[PDB]
Amino acid sequence: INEQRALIKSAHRYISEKLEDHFSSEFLPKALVICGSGLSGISTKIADEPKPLILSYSTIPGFGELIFGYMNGAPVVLMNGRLHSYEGHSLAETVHPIRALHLLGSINVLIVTNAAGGINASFKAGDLMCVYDHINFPGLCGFHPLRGANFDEFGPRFLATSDAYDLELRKLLFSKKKELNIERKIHEGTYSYVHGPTFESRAESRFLRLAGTDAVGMSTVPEVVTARHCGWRVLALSLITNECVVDPPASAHDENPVPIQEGKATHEEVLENSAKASKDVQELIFSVVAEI
Amino acid sequence: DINEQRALIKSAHRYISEKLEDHFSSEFLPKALVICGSGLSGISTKIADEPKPLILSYSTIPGFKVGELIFGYMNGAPVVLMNGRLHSYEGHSLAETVHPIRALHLLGSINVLIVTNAAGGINASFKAGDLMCVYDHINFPGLCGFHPLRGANFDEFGPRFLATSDAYDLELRKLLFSKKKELNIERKIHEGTYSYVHGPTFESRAESRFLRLAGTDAVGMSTVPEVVTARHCGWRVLALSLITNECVVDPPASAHDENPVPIQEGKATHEEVLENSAKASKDVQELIFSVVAEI
Amino acid sequence: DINEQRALIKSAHRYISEKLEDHFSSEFLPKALVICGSGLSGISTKIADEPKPLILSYSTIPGFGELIFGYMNGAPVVLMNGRLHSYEGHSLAETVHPIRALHLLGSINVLIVTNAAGGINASFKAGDLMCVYDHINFPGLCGFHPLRGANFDEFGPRFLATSDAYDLELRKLLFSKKKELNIERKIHEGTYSYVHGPTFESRAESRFLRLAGTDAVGMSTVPEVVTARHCGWRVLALSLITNECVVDPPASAHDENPVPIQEGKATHEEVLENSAKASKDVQELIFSVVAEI
Ligand code: HPA
Ligand code: HPA
Ligand code: HPA
C-alpha cells in the first residue's frame, strides 16, 4: 500500500505542477468526466480561452490523455482513455487516476458514461439509462477496488454503497434533458457490473434480469466505488447499445427454430449505437457541468 | 506450494503443541475452537483462572499473520479461543485466513467449531439486536473461485470433494436453542441462511435485494471459509450471527419523486455495527459459555 | 504474460505438429477435439488400429494426461484424456492452453466435451444426460474468466458473444443419433452452470442456482467452451447427471421429526458410480456423432 501511496503522490505532484505552469490563474477542477461511450468528442466543447491543457497518460506517473480546461464556464478534468478490468489490469491501476486527482482538492463530482446491454424488457437500443443503483458482482466475490489495506486518509474501511448515486445530480440531468428538449429516452435503473469480456449468454441475461438488473456493462462501478470512497458525488449515465438476448436458444426438437445467432451482440453494434447517441450525451453532459 | 503450506501448518502445530506441554500440568486437549467475532470480544474473560490459561499471540506462532489464541478451560471444558481473526478484504489469502484451523486440527482433539460474527439483516423480519443461528450458507466468492479449498487437496485432512449440504450440525443447533431457553434469554434467535460476501463495502440496495432474492437471511464478510475448512477437517460447526443492522433494500429515490427519501437515510455504518455488537455481547457470551460445557 | 502464453502455445504446437508428421505417413488434420471427461474415459478404445494412433503424454508437450491422435469412426480426431480443473489451482490460461495449442493445427472446427454434473432441475435424475444448449459462467461474471487479459487477436474478437455458444445442428445430430442408436436413457436439453468447486453445493447454493435458471451444475467445461468459441469452433457439450443436488431446506432445530441433514449428500463415490453406468451410452453416442461432424 505504501508504494501505491507513493505512486499517487508522484502523480499528483506531476499534475499540479503542470497546471500552475500552464494556467495564469490557479486551475481547480470541480468535476472529473470519464469520457466513455457517447463522450468521445466532448473535448471539442472545451473553451478556447483560457487555453486548455492536454497531458498524455504516458508522462503522468501511474497512468490516452487528461484534458484540463473550461467547459460551459466550468473548470473540469476529462479522462480520454480508461483501463478496463478485463484487460488484465488490477483494480488499483484502473482507479489510480481518481485517487491521484483527488489530491488536487477541488474535484467533488465524478461524471462517467459507458455502453451497456439492456436487460430491462422495456429498454431499446439507443435509449439511455441514468444509474441510480448498482450490483458489483466481481466485488461481492473478491474482485474489489477496496480490497487490501484501507487508504485511511481517503475514506472509511467499511464504505456504504446504498447512497452511491447522488439524487440531486440525477434531477439535474433530467432537468437538462427537458431544457434541451432532447427526445431520447432516459430511464432510471440498476446497473450491473460484470467482468466481461464476453457478452452475456441468454441464461446469464435471464439471471441478471431476475437479480434486478436493468442494464449490464463491463466497467464504471469500480470507479464509482472509489470516487465514493473519496467522498465524491457521482453521476453515471449508461448508453443502451444493444438489447440483451434472453429467450432460450432454439431447441433441437423445434420444427421451425429461431437461429441461435439471431440478434447476437457485436462490438460493431456497440460502436455504431454509441456514435448515434453521442451528440445527445455530449450536449446533456455539457449542460450539466455548468451547474455543478 | 501445498508443501510450503504444509510446512507452515506443521511448524505452527509444533510450536503450539510444545507450548501446551510446557504450560499445562496435565495434557491439554481442547474439544472446541471458538472464533470470537462480534459479541464475543469479552468471552476470554470467562476462561477459568485455574488452571492458568495459555495465551499465544499470532505474532509468536508460525504462519499466523495478524490477534491471539487462548487455551484454557471454559465451564469445565478445554477450549481454544481465537481473538482477532483475519479478513480477506484486508488482503489476506483464504489459505492464510484458515491456516489456524488446520494447525489446531493437528492437536487431534478438536471436533467442534463455534463461530460468531456480525451480519446485516436481509430477511425483512429481522431487526437490529436479533441473533441468527446459522443452518445453511451461500458461499458466493467460493462459487466464483475465491475458495479456501482451492489448490492441491490436503488429503491428510479431508476429501478432494467436500459436501456442504450438511455443514451446520443439527444437534448443536438444538443445544443452542435449549440453552437460550435455559438462560431465559428474551433476545430473538432466528434460524436461517448466511451469505458470505467479500466486502469491505456494505451492500447497495440492489445488492441486498439480490441477496434476499437468492435466499439470504443475513449477510456478512466472514466465517464461511472457516466453516468450510472446519468441515473439510471433519469438525462439527455451530455458527451464530449478530444482526447488527437492517440492510437497506428499497429502491433509492427517483429523480421524478416530488418528495424523495434521502438516499443516505438508514445507511449502514461501522459505528452502528460496533454499538450493536456491544449491546448483544452479554447474551451471546452467556449463550456460548453454556453451550461449550455440553460439547 | 500474454507473451509467455503465446510462447507456450507456439512451442506446444511445434512439438505436436512435428510428432504428427513423423508418426503418420499421411498428413493428419483432426476435425474435432474430444475432451474425454466423464462417461468418455474408455472411448480411446474405439480409435481405429489403422493407421496406428499417436499417444502424446502431457509431460512431453510444452505447457501441458495424454493426447491421442487417430481415426474414430472414419474421422480424424484428437482426444484429450486428462483435463486441468481450476479447483486444483491451475490458472484458466493453463486449463484452456490445449485448445489454443491445437487450434494452430488449423483443422479442428468442433469441440466435443463431456463432464459430470449435479442435477439442479428438480425433474432430473441421476443417470440422465443433458445436452447443453446454454450456460451460466458465474466465475466469469465475477472475474475468473478465460479471456481475461490482453486479447489473442490471432484467434478471435475482444468481445465474444455467447448467446450462440451451443451449435443447433450439432445438438440435432446428437438427438438424431440417440434415436438411431435406440438409447432409452433420457437426454435433457438445458442450462449448465459452471462453479469453481471443489465443494459440492449447499442446499441454499443449489436453491440459488435453481432460481438463477440452472438445470445442471458442474466444476468444469465452460471455460473450454468459451475458449473454443473464441477460436471460432462449434461446440457440442454433454453433461452426465451423476447425482441429484440436495435443495430442500435443512432440518430445523424446532422440528419434531427432522430429516437427517446428511441424507442423500453428494459424494465423489456416487459421481464415479453413475459416470460408469452411463459410459457405454455416452461413448456410443459420441462415436456415432463424430462420423458426421
Ligand atoms: O450486452 C452487453 N453486455 C455487457 N457489456 C456491454 N456493453 C455494451 N453492451 C453490453
Ligand atoms: O450490512 C452488512 N453487510 C455486510 N456485512 C455486515 N456486517 C454487519 N453488517 C453488515
Ligand atoms: O453436485 C454437483 N455439484 C458440482 N459439480 C458436480 N459434478 C458432479 N456432481 C456435482
Author numbering:
A (entry chain C): 6 to 68, 78 to 306
B (entry chain A): 5 to 70, 78 to 306
C (entry chain B): 5 to 68, 78 to 306
Quote the original article.
PNP (PNP: E.C. 2.4.2.1) catalyzes the reversible phosphorolysis of N-ribosidic bonds of nucleosides and generates a purine base and ribose-1- phosphate. The homotrimeric class enzymes utilize 6-oxopurines as substrates, while the homohexameric class enzymes utilize 6-oxopurines and 6-aminopurines. In the present study, we report the structural and biochemical characterization of K. lactis PNP (KlacPNP). Based on the observed oligomeric state in solution, KlacPNP can be classified in the low molecular mass, homotrimeric class of NP-I family of nucleoside phosphorylases.
We report the crystal structure of KlacPNP at 1.97 Å resolution and observed an extra electron density at the active site. There were three molecules in the asymmetric unit, corresponding to one biological trimer of KlacPNP. All three monomers assembled to form a trimer having a non-crystallographic, 3-fold symmetry. The most distinguishing feature of KlacPNP is the presence of a long loop connecting β9 and α7, which participates extensively in establishing intermolecular interactions. A catalytic site is formed in the vicinity of the intersubunit interface, where Phe172 from adjacent monomer participates in the formation of an active site pocket. Based on the observed mass, we could unambiguously identify the bound ligand as hypoxanthine. Hypoxanthine remained bound to the protein throughout the protein purification steps and crystallization process, suggesting high affinity of hypoxanthine to KlacPNP. In addition to five potential hydrogen bonds between protein and hypoxanthine, two indirect water-mediated interactions are also observed. In addition to hydrogen bonds, π-π interactions mediated by the Phe213 side chain, lying almost perpendicular to the planar ring of the ligand, are also present. Similarly, in the crystal structure of KlacPNP, the structurally equivalent Asn256 forms the hydrogen bond with O6 of hypoxanthine, which is an end-product of inosine phosphorolysis.
